[PDB]
Amino acid sequence: PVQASLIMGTHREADLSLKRVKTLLNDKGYQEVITYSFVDPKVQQMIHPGVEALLLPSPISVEMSAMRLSLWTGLLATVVYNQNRQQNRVRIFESGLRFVPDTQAPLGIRQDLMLAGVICGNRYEEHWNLAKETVDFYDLKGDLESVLDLTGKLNEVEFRAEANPALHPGQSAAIYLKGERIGFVGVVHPELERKLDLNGRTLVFELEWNKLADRVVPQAREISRFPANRRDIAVVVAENVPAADILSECKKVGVNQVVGVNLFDVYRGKGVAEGYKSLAISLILQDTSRTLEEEEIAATVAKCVEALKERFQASLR
Amino acid sequence: MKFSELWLREWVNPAIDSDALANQITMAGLEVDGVEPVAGSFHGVVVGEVVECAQHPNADKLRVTKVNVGGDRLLDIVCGAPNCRQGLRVAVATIGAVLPGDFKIKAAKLRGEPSEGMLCSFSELGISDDHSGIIELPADAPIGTDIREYLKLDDNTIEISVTPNRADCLGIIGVARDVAVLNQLPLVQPEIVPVGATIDDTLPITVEAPEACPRYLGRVVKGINVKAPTPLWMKEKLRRCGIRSIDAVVDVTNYVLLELGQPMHAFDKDRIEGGIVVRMAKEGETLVLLDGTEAKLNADTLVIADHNKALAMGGIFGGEHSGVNDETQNVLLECAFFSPLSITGRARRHGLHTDASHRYERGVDPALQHKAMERATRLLIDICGGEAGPVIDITNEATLPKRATITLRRSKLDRLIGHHIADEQVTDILRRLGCEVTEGKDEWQAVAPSWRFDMEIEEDLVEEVARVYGYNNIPDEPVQASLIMGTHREADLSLKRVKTLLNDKGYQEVITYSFVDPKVQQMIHPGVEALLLPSPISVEMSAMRLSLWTGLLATVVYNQNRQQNRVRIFESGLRFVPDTQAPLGIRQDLMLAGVICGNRYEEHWNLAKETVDFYDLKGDLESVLDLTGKLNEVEFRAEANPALHPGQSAAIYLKGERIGFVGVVHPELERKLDLNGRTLVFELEWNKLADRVVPQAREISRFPANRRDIAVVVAENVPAADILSECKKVGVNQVVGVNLFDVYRGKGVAEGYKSLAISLILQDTSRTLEEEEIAATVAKCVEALKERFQASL
Amino acid sequence: HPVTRTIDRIESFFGELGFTVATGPEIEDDYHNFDALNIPGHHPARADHDTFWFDTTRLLRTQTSGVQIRTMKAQQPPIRIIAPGRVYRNDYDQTHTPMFHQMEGLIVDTNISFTNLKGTLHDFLRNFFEEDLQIRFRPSYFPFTEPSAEVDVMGKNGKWLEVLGCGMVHPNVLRNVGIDPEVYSGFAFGMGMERLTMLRYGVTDLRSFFENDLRFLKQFK
Amino acid sequence: HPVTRTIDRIESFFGELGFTVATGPEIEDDYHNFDALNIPGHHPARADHDTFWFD
Numbered sequence A: 001p002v003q004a005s006l007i008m009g010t011h012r013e014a015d016l017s018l019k020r021v022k023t024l025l026n027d028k029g030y031q032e033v034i035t036y037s038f039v040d041p042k043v044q045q046m047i048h049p050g051v052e053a054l055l056l057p058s059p060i061s062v063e064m065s066a067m068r069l070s071l072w073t074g075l076l077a078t079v080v081y082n083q084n085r086q087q088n089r090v091r092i093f094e095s096g097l098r099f100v101p102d103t104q105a106p107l108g109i110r111q112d113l114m115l116a117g118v119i120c121g122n123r124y125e126e127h128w129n130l131a132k133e134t135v136d137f138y139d140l141k142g143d144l145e146s147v148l149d150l151t152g153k154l155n156e157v158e159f160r161a162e163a164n165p166a167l168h169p170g171q172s173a174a175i176y177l178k179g180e181r182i183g184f185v186g187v188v189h190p191e192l193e194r195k196l197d198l199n200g201r202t203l204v205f206e207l208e209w210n211k212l213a214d215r216v217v218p219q220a221r222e223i224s225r226f227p228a229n230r231r232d233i234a235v236v237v238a239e240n241v242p243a244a245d246i247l248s249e250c251k252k253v254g255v256n257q258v259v260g261v262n263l264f265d266v267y268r269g270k271g272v273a274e275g276y277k278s279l280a281i282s283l284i285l286q287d288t289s290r291t292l293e294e295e296e297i298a299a300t301v302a303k304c305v306e307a308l309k310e311r312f313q314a315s316l317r
Numbered sequence B: 001m002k003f004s005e006l007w008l009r010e011w012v013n014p015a016i017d018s019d020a021l022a023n024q025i026t027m028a029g030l031e032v033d034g035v036e037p038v039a040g041s042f043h044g045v046v047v048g049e050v051v052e053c054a055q056h057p058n059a060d061k062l063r064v065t066k067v068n069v070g071g072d073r074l075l076d077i078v079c080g081a082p083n084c085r086q087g088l089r090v091a092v093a094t095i096g097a098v099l100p101g102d103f104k105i106k107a108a109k110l111r112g113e114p115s116e117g118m119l120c121s122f123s124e125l126g127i128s129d130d131h132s133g134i135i136e137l138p139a140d141a142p143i144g145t146d147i148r149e150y151l152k153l154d155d156n157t158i159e160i161s162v163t164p165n166r167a168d169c170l171g172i173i174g175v176a177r178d179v180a181v182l183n184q185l186p187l188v189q190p191e192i193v194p195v196g197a198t199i200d201d202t203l204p205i206t207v208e209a210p211e212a213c214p215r216y217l218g219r220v221v222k223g224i225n226v227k228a229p230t231p232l233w234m235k236e237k238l239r240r241c242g243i244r245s246i247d248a249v250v251d252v253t254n255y256v257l258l259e260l261g262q263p264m265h266a267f268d269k270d271r272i273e274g275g276i277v278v279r280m281a282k283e284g285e286t287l288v289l290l291d292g293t294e295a296k297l298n299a300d301t302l303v304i305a306d307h308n309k310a311l312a313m314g315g316i317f318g319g320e321h322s323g324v325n326d327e328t329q330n331v332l333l334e335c336a337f338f339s340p341l342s343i344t345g346r347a348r349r350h351g352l353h354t355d356a357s358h359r360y361e362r363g364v365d366p367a368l369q370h371k372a373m374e375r376a377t378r379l380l381i382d383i384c385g386g387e388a389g390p391v392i393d394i395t396n397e398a399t400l401p402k403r404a405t406i407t408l409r410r411s412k413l414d415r416l417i418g419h420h421i422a423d424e425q426v427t428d429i430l431r432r433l434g435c436e437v438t439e440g441k442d443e444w445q446a447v448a449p450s451w452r453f454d455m456e457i458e459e460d461l462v463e464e465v466a467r468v469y470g471y472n473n474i475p476d477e478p479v480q481a482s483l484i485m486g487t488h489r490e491a492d493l494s495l496k497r498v499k500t501l502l503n504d505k506g507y508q509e510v511i512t513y514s515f516v517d518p519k520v521q522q523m524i525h526p527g528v529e530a531l532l533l534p535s536p537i538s539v540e541m542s543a544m545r546l547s548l549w550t551g552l553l554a555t556v557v558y559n560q561n562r563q564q565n566r567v568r569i570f571e572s573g574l575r576f577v578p579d580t581q582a583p584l585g586i587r588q589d590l591m592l593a594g595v596i597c598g599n600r601y602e603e604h605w606n607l608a609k610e611t612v613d614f615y616d617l618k619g620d621l622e623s624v625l626d627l628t629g630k631l632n633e634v635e636f637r638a639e640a641n642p643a644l645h646p647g648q649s650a651a652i653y654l655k656g657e658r659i660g661f662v663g664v665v666h667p668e669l670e671r672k673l674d675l676n677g678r679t680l681v682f683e684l685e686w687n688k689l690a691d692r693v694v695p696q697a698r699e700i701s702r703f704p705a706n707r708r709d710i711a712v713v714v715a716e717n718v719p720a721a722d723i724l725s726e727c728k729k730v731g732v733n734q735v736v737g738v739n740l741f742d743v744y745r746g747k748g749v750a751e752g753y754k755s756l757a758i759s760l761i762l763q764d765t766s767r768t769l770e771e772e773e774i775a776a777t778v779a780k781c782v783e784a785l786k787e788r789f790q791a792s793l
Numbered sequence C: 001h002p003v004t005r006t007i008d009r010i011e012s013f014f015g016e017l018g019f020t021v022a023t024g025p026e027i028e029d030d031y032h033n034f035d036a037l038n039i040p041g042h043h044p045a046r047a048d049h050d051t052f053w054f055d056t057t058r059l060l061r062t063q064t065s066g067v068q069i070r071t072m073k074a075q076q077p078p079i080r081i082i083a084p085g086r087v088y089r090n091d092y093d094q095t096h097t098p099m100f101h102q103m104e105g106l107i108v109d110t111n112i113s114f115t116n117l118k119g120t121l122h123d124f125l126r127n128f129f130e131e132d133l134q135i136r137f138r139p140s141y142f143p144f145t146e147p148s149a150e151v152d153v154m155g156k157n158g159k160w161l162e163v164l165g166c167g168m169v170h171p172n173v174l175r176n177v178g179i180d181p182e183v184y185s186g187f188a189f190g191m192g193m194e195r196l197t198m199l200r201y202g203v204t205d206l207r208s209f210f211e212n213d214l215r216f217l218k219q220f221k
Numbered sequence D: 001h002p003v004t005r006t007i008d009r010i011e012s013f014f015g016e017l018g019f020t021v022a023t024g025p026e027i028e029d030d031y032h033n034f035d036a037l038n039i040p041g042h043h044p045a046r047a048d049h050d051t052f053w054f055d
């Protein structure tokens, strides 16, 4: 056996293990997949039209002659592959490099490690007590929020509606962390879904791994031995106003006392004018040194309502 | 161990401040626990004399006083202390002085008479709790001098933890000797000249247990004044070491204990019938200790006795009769060396713990008795008067312990430490510690000094060399070793992998105490006797847990009492079940348990509020069991459990072995525990699922498969899993999948009967199937449900 | 649980050095908890040890030494194990709970020295607190090691803070498990997980670990 | 993925011996894939590997 020193090396608790994220995805019903780094440029052109990919002179075949600009060509080819074998429900993910031509990158090609995945079919397998419903946008986002919650920075994640040629423009989001774009998520565009011959609605995502490979190290905070108070507010805004921004404003305006902000209902129909919506939000208030009385509770709740008035032109009901 | 820094500095005074000296003592191995000031913070208090003292003309119990403080003229002071009288040397807080508590001394009148300061008690100066009267200073106290300088109140008491190896560090001399070695300084020792005897008085002393007492020193002092006051300098050194002053004879013996580490005792010579007999006690001897209580002694306990009765416990505690009292005029001073093994454990047996027993059971210097006897003799007669007889020396050279001769090898020193310390430094360190060292070829032969009881083998000298050289002067070096792989087993399932899945299903890990309240555990596991602690921290933590449910259910109640109804937690840990076939009569199995309650999810804009039920927890349990790859061989059988709902509880079986339980907490148990609502618990024997299946690639059919649904109506009490298991077992290699997707009972099915909608997937690895063979197989499956169960529809 | 976070980090630190995790029962006999560690029946650190006894032989362990003694008896060197587990003492204050967690390490090889003890634990402390922090080794005493030491970390308030204990395995301990101290040597160490967790994440009350308030535990996800 | 299980097992075997995992890009240059490995341009390994070149 080798006779050498025993030195530990340098660890960093703030690192987020990719294997830990894979374990979470497995525990959410996802199978790991490994696809070829070179794909058919015909298919990739249907997904990323007009984007010139680094091509292989003298490839193994024409269908494996283009370095993948994302992981979606290989992923979407895998679900079609399985759907041709009588398997409609496909929930898979893959980690691997993408190759985007970039003159400012070494060797003229930028090589980023990505985490991507796709889901389709029913939410669950056939079950005597689980309803047969096709998977939707908020199913995939729920799994993505589970992944991003491992960083401890979920309070700083944003899903902004953003156009991507491969995605349905009304159900697609660019993902942001602390203002930094980290990925994209949405249902595949129906025309792109009609192409490739996909069985129904399919949901894809892709995350730049190194953007979220860090996590917050916990610092203990004191717990109040005094009881907390809940106050709900009804907030009516225009439809196009994102609900997460109202929540974000509430948390930012009430920092000292407001220890919790949660949306529990969103209503748009009879009772609210067309083109508008009402957001039911619970505000939990607590203090570490005393119990709160109605005067201070009402003052802070009013402080949050006025901030929603200033920023969103919201109204209380 | 408490001691005065200034007293220690009388023996060794390194040119460094209190913080550094205390750090040095800590770095010697005597960790300082605290450093406290000797007196309160004040200024403007000086030595004075009561020149004139008279009755206060307007207050019955006050006095008016002229005080000389060495100023231009005498001061008018009013004093109400009972001991105030003319000629007294006192501590005078003059005008402008500030006393502890920001108590400024101003000139004022008290009951009509002027007072230009006040006479102070020890309590007012923050020196002690003495407020019975004003401080009385020695008659030669220097008038006008700051009492902080005269009483040395700029001093600290240093408290150190002394581990049992450093038996030599239970006195001023021993702590100072170690500090001197660390500073490469000599030790300054008091001149202790022997007291010459002026009378011939003795008494017979015979030792029947010379193994327990290799040396006993008796000495008589005739005609002492037991009522003589202890001088202030001795009261202060006693107090700054944590010992209050009692009477003059006990005070001198406590002083030599503090100074030299030698315990000593004083008998009333007139209450000694015959002589002194240092012997073992008889089995069942009765002795009334000095605290008034009676002790029933065993034959392994050493006693100091006379020719009739036992007088004291040797080196532990004194008796009530033979001690010094108010009428005592003649004393017999004891100063002995007792064998540590003969004293150890006896004090704890009778709930005793004294300064003497603590030192004797760790080891007092067997070459110290004569010097300590002469020290006490002079101090006693200089305080209480009297005449000293000759020293009665009963020493047994055969049982007297011998100084150890130890060989320190260069090879062992360099190997254990890993750092070469020069030869001259090694021999210098050992000699300053008191060893007789002769150098050899790559070796040292050392004779340990008489006071060290932790120098028997070579490694002891390695530590002495290392600790004096300096631990932090030794460099760092990585371990050299072989890079040999451990033995891995891919079939191992990790507990950390299971904890991760539970986290990814919404479970928070908790850790609870292993001893619980038997009042509440007897509610969860009634009739099951648990292992109890005879001496618990409390009765609510006196029963070793038979499961993890007592800790988990106390945790949800705790959180629910703090406005949190929804709690989903788990825990891994041992249970303790009495088992005569187990090691130590108690079987300790590693368990994995958890509990959920409240709504399935937190409040959500797209999820509706629904309370958790049995199939929610069972789903999480199937996710855990699926990690083993043996979920096909798991059975949930309804089974009785006193803590659980009889209609919603199941025993978990794996390959015909019960591995755990799961179910809704019984509603009456829910009531008694003050649970907010429906609560579901589980528990698994961990080692039964710490093993998993290693995958083995099987061929996949390239030919399509076919699905046929059937609706079977059976009895309401027939478990659906047995029906599914029958379709999978009775079916040949054609049917590859059996799944239940509906369970109906109501308008259409008879009462007490249910319809189970089952999907059967059929496929072959070599060919494709057609309707003939397909329908013949679902017909074969449905006929298997005819005799064992009921027909279809 | 935050204590689990700590135990997992330390297991990964020493796992890269070839240290195997070993566990054992929490109820032990006086042999594996005292006698095998060179602590005779008359030894002070035994009766005056705040120990929970059931009878004269069975006790709630004060250290995870039982698994370390059994491992040494069952194999010759090299030995490289760490032993985490719950231990028990009678005290109960703001900084003391009757139950707590201890991580104990042991390595036994041919030329294990005190210099290796310093370097290994200095590496460990630098990784655990993730900084080039001030530490010191300080003479101490344990019946099962010689030389013995405690290591302190410079506290944020200017005072040294005792973090762990260590030493070179006593030759009596090696002898009664069948290991020749003239051929083999080794060092061992022990540390409390609650203490290190408090210093790492800023927890100020040790009792919070066992109250299991979901608001305290949720901070450590 | 089955090969991921294999990689993770091998990483844990050598990790106990102090072997640190290191990763890098998959498109490499002439120097790091051949030249620094004692494989000059006139060495048959630049063809015995049957390399996918871009230029």
Ligand SMILES: C[C@@H](CC1CCCCC1)NCc1ccccc1O
Residues within 6 Å of the ligand: C037, C063, C064, C065, C068, C069, C104, C105, C106, C142, C144, C145, C165, C166, C167, C169, C170, C173, C188, C189, C190, C191
């Ligand atoms: C109680 C011991 C038990 C081991 C010691 C020697 C070999 C047997 C097991 N725990 C490790 C340890 C080491 C040094 C100081 C404190 C400490 O806690």
Ligand SMILES: [Mg+2]
Residues within 6 Å of the ligand: B165, B454, B460, B463, B464, C146
């Ligand atoms: Mg020693």
